[PDB]
Structure 1
Amino acid sequence: EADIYQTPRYLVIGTGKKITLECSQTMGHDKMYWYQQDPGMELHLIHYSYGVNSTEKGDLSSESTVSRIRTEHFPLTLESARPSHTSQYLCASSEFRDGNEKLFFGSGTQLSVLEDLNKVFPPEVAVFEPSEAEISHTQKATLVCLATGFYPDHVELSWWVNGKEVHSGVCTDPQPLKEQPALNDSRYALSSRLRVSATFWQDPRNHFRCQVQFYGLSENDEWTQDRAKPVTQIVSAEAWGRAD
């Protein structure tokens, strides 16, 4: 059964820390790979393995290491995090099927390495209620959710109606927006819409919640600021349907 699995999906860490990115497959594939892709570039091979005891550098300059002691596992280690390690890390395995090396990828780790942890901020979340000018004209009601002030760009926004996640009538910006573009470490904003029928909205028993999962600092992380520690957390805002 199964496939290929990578964790964590998201990581923000201080500089100089050791990092291990995990990769496993249950397909019994001999060949396994690590690819990296910075903001501006294509995927590029950093390490590969022909099987147990085989570990090869695909990029000579890379200061990551791998090991292969089990067919199943191909972990990647960064002994000393530098900002330049901030990247997307994709693990893959392959096999020969019909004389073709066919690759299967994990879903990646988004790694953010920061010189200064004080630039980490969780999102603030607001829900804006449908315009009555929208409702009376269109018979439909759009809720807007704004998540603001977060850094890095490591968030997942979801909509929950009456306690259950919804996908119908939802659109979330594919990319966030820089609140202060003139800073390459600018905080970020993201919006999403949830559109329901006006009568669904006008029902007071209906409960709407915009939820943003932020991935930030972990428990053990050092912190000294006069402001709550920006740990991994959920931030939400909610709204009730209202007649009117």
Structure 2
Amino acid sequence: MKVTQMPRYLIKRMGENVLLECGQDMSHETMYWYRQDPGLGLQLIYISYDVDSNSEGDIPKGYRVSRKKREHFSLILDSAKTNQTSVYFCASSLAGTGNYEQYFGPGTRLTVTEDLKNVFPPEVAVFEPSEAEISHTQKATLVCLATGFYPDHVELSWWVNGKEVHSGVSTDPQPLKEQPALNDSRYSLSSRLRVSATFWQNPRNHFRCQVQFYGLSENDEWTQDRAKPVTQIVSAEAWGRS
């Protein structure tokens, strides 16, 4: 029993129409749209208690809502503003009082940007393990750096010998601004993959860090000399070394 949300990532230019969608299969009467911003908590935008029974939350300004079926609840920004950059969570409960458990969706991370020329895919680099580490510990830590990207919409994974691995992987919790003082700052993210010294020492083995970037779509206009920063994967690969 689950709450779903679509899409997961969104990059829009200011002034554009934006539609977020929420589904729910528990026959829940009540549905909710929240946003979550650093430091502030979960802020309620709209609550819906029955089809066409929508009530304002604390911060309804700049938002509209649609409940035509019991199973779906829609959030609409008619003309998106940059300060509507946020993570949006829908929820549902069995009836509308606070006493009922709210079941939350996985979130939509929306970035609203002044100009799409602010959008950049990541550059990706893999750093080979230190021989000093190998000598000291008999283990070898590769590091991946994803740098220069905007918005912070990425998923990093490691592929060893053509297969995704999770064992021995530790990735930074979130991308970090390269220049925290700038609204449109680009971002970096790092990850480590640790293997044994003998696994790294086998020249048959190959290690690819992959970063899925969520970028522009076909709808978005692009006239820039540089490649259009569409949704794409950027990878870097290293081979084991005797």
Q: Distance in 2 between matches of 1:16 and 1:181?
A: 25
Partner of 1:64: 63
The answer for unaligned runs of 5 or more in structure 1 is none
Q: Distance in 2 between matches of 1:203 and 1:60?
A: 57
Shift of 1:238: 0.5
Q: Distance in 2 between matches of 1:182 and 1:34?
A: 30
Aligned residues of 2:44 and 2:59 also touching (Cα < 8 A):
no
One-letter amino acid of the structure 2 residue matched with residue 74 of structure 1:
F
One-letter amino acid of the structure 1 residue matched with residue 189 of structure 2:
L
Partner of 1:119: 118
**Identity, % of aligned pairs?**
74
Q: Call closer, same or farther: CA 1:182–1:75 in 2, change over 3 Å.
A: closer
Q: Distance in 1 between matches of 2:83 and 2:112?
A: 7
Partner of 1:205: 204
Shift of 1:177: 2.8
Shift of 1:184: 2.6
Shift of 1:60: 5.6
TM-score (norm 2): 0.95
Deviations 1:32-85 (A, max 9, x none): 111112233111111111111211111364221111111110011111111121
Q: Distance in 1 between matches of 2:183 and 2:73?
A: 33
One-letter amino acid of the structure 1 residue matched with residue 19 of structure 2:
T
Q: Distance in 1 between matches of 2:58 and 2:108?
A: 19
Shift of 1:182: 3.7
TM-score (norm 1): 0.94
Q: Does 1:163 align with 2:174?
A: no
Partner of 2:10: 11
Q: Call closer, same or farther: CA 1:135–1:154 in 2, change over 3 Å.
A: same
Q: Distance in 2 between matches of 1:154 and 1:89?
A: 14
The answer for unaligned runs of 5 or more in structure 2 is none
Q: Does 176-185 or 221-230 show the bigger shift?
A: 176-185
Q: Distance in 2 between matches of 1:109 and 1:48?
A: 17
Partner of 1:223: 222
Q: Call closer, same or farther: CA 1:143–1:64 in 2, change over 3 Å.
A: same
Aligned residues of 2:172 and 2:189 also touching (Cα < 8 A):
yes
Partner of 2:39: 40
Partner of 1:185: 184
Q: Distance in 2 between matches of 1:221 and 1:176?
A: 24
Deviations 1:110-134 (A, max 9, x none): 1100111111110000001111121
Query: How many pairs does the alignment contain?
Result: 240
Deviations 1:117-153 (A, max 9, x none): 1111100000011111211221101000000000111
Aligned residues of 2:179 and 2:186 also touching (Cα < 8 A):
yes
Aligned residues of 2:43 and 2:59 also touching (Cα < 8 A):
no
| RMSD of aligned alpha carbons | 1.5
Partner of 1:95: 94
Q: Call closer, same or farther: CA 1:61–1:4 in 2, change over 3 Å.
A: closer
Q: Does 1:175 align with 2:174?
A: yes
Q: 2:129 aligns to what SS in structure 1?
A: coil
Partner of 1:241: 240
Partner of 1:214: 213
Partner of 1:152: 151
